Symmetry: C2
Amino acid sequence: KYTYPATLLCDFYKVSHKEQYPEGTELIYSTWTPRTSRVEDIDRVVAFGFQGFIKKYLIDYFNENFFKRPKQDVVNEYKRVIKHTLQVDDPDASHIESLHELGYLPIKIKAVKEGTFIPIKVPMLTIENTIPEFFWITNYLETLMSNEIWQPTTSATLAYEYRKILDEYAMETVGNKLAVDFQGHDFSMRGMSSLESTKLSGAGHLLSFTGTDTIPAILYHEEFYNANIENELVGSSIPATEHSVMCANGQDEYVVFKKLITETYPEGFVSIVSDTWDFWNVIDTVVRKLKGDILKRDGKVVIRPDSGDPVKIICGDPEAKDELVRKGLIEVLWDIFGGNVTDKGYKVLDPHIGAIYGDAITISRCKEICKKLAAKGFASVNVVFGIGSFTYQYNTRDTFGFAMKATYTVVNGEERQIFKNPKTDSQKGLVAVVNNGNELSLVDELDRNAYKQLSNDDILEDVFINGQLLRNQTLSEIRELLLD
Amino acid sequence: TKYTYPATLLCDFYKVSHKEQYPEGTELIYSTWTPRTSRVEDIDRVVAFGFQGFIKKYLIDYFNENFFKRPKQDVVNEYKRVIKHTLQVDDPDASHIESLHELGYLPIKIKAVKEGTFIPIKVPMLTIENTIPEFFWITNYLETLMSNEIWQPTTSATLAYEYRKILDEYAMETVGNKLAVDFQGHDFSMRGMSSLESTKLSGAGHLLSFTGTDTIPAILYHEEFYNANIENELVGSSIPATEHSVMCANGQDEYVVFKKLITETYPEGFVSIVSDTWDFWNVIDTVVRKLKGDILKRDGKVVIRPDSGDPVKIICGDPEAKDELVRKGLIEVLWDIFGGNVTDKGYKVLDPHIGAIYGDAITISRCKEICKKLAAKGFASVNVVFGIGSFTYQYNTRDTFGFAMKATYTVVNGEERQIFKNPSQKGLVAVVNNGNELSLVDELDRNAYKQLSNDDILEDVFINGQLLRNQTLSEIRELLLD
Ligand SMILES: NC(=O)c1cccnc1
Ligand SMILES: NC(=O)c1cccnc1
């Protein structure tokens, strides 16, 4: 098998930095901070992902690929890469040798509880070396950790933006939040940039919702967050057709739909994409004609449109003159099947029929759909939203301004602050995050004495020290912390 | 733990339900991978890259190690557990998983253009189908993961090439050769990639066009899947470089810090020093200027790395500034101190003992603008190395080049049929050399397709567990640039 050395998962210049530090550098202490927000109406992030990164890479990857292997092997892989990529005849690997001899990562990582709302410009995590000789290790890990933990948090925040909307309109139209868990459904896996990013993003999505088509995300929560699908609802989905299946089955859409709902899935949920040729014809002449069969099933038939303006398809096009197009999918389905009326006067479809829209959904479009459904007396729970790769893939580390910055060093016993301040266009010292009334706040410019003085109010907790994981959060606990 | 993600569950959930929804007697499903549109200006072709890595890693390595070599009962149970407790089925059917395991290999056929080829928008570049009728369902099942894994390596490879394109033309125009270009596009993006795997795929795409990179895992990726060997070829290269935290740790007497770095820590070779920790222009005026003799005595090159301000103005100058150094820009000021040479085209190139690199807020547009404005001042484009970061490589979707996996062809009870929605590609597809361009041919039945096979530039890459094409990084670089 091909091994990527655990000592070279970084930018190239991280390798060179060790010899550049001042003589007698004994400690380097770095923080992980979302420094700004580039999503409207989002001023906090949902901290998530540190545990998965620590378990997969700092514990498992370093043990299996570095510490349990012979010293000569890891030394040689490192030296080979350095020699042939940095043009060094005899690279120094004595620090690698010494780390391997130590047998564990002399590292202290602290972090806020995953599931916590962290304000912009407030640090969520810190890392430091626990043995002076390995000061260089802190800087070394900055790249990989950044590379790994901005995506799960980012997705976690974006998903929550949906949940917050879906909760509120639910409370506004129904009076309870029972349907919201399934109202946000992850459709994004094919549009994520890699399977690993698929796992991290979908795992973020699953903090707020249980509906997903991203199987590896459910299994990710099993792998790193102590979930078990046999004992708790981690994630769930329903049988659903796709355009190629509908096309293969042919244009006698009544026969195809009837076979799908009475023979292939006579009970339970089933989602049928209905726009392969003529969506409104399927609604008018197929779904209507199958009304008795749909009502006779012990389950739900979910109608899935996949083209047009999602807002206008779901809520209606006011300027369209065909009655079905002007009414919209939800109103036409109510006209066919009816349903129930909430205590606040909003219509909920008969539970034998339902709708889902999983193309071109955005946070703004989700809010608009809920608002326009309420404007005509339909409850928000009548639509399931399919959230795609536009939400979960199309971000950067800068979408929430994440950066890992060294804020504190100890050099020959002297405590020192680190910060840049370019004239061509910040955190200092040890940091702490304290609960001040309603919100969390950053305290910086702290020496070791002042940092210890504040230890009882700091909400960052010991997560990983010298190879030992000290905090092991479950998915249920994180969901509890997020949604109370 | 040794947690195993089942090889049969790397997909969208509804892929699992599609098998029973196909018509009776479905014997073949055939799908294509096409970039349908371009959302990047001046780009109407993509660099085909990624298929070999996905095929080796997942279709060969992953499936053999985690599915075919394991006990049949174990894979069956791992499938049933997930389906039962996530699709709320009491007794899931796994007889097809059992049949696949008994078969012992993936009964699929994948064709793809050679990696490194330029594929125009709306031209397919990969197809997949099943080779045994019973396993018609395999094609559809594999669509998610394949799409998950191959849009990013191509996108990066395409975006990287755009930089190369600009850097090539300007080199040809201001130097007369492209020798310096390989190191002019330098990948800085790893910390901003969404995952280590995405880091690897994107950096490999970048390394198709450039040799300069700070993303070590990308170099090693080309070793793992594209037969590269850093002992015998230059896959990726980088140089010693400082960062802001180290500059702060060394203190504000930047004369002594720089002197130590360039005469003691790295007395020879390349060394990149980021110089804007407190005052970039002061560093240029009083540190680099005072160190000119020391810099010129080195058998090597000191590279100056600014990291803040308008990149175009820092590198090429700010015409409206009153300070002479700010007005001139870094390249001209360095020229004033160190001098240099004139190329065959009449453009100035810095003395090889000094250099410049800029790796913050670089875009394709800014790289072109920097080259253009440097040329307008008489300075060759090779005076600047461009650090390309995550804004280029990460801030994309599969929709940036409109990638889609579309079933286009099926065989049901021996009847050939075309698959397409009209709420497009129909039938079997081929890509042929049509004068000077590549053209899509579709609406082909099997007979016409076989007739055209010798002209199709799509080639057999994977069949029934057999790797049929094994391209090297050097071959792909040769196809792309030559
Ligand atoms: N289940 C679905 O309808 C689905 C899933 C993923 C992507 N698109 C649609
Ligand atoms: N070598 C560098 O200066 C560098 C690399 C990656 C990211 N940022 C800076």
